[PDB]
Amino acid sequence: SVKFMDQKRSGEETVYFKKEDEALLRNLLANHPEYDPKYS
Amino acid sequence: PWTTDTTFDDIILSQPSKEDFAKFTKEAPLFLRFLKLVTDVEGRQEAFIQFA
Numbered sequence: 001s002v003k004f005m006d007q008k009r010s011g012e013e014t015v016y017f018k019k020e021d022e023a024l025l026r027n028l029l030a031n032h033p034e035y036d037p038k039y040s
Numbered sequence: 041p042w043t044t045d046t047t048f049d050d051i052i053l054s055q056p057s058k059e060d061f062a063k064f065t066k067e068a069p070l071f072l073r074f075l076k077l078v079t080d081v082e083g084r085q086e087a088f089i090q091f092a
Contacts, residue, residue: 033089039076040085 068092 029036046062054060072092079088 039089039092040080 029038033039049056075088075091079085
């Protein structure tokens with residue numbers, strides 16, 4: 001129950017925020033071109 | 041060569057305008073590398089950002 005809930009929580013959070021980080025990595029360089037080293 | 045939308049003519053006889061001229065898509069990256077170098081030297085990246 002303890003390791004159960006902990007690992008379930010960790011996996012769910014990991015998946016959710018992996019998706020969110022993928023989306024943010026997709027949409028970063030457009031909205032913040034001053035950081036893109038492609039343009040530097 | 042055959043085209044369904046374009047026609048070839050003499051520039052002085054046609055007196056074409058900018059919209060009468062035909063448009064195509066050109067690949068940037070070979071030019072964009074040199075442009076990146078030149079802009080990184082000259083110190084004007086806003087223009088590069090707009091153009092890119």
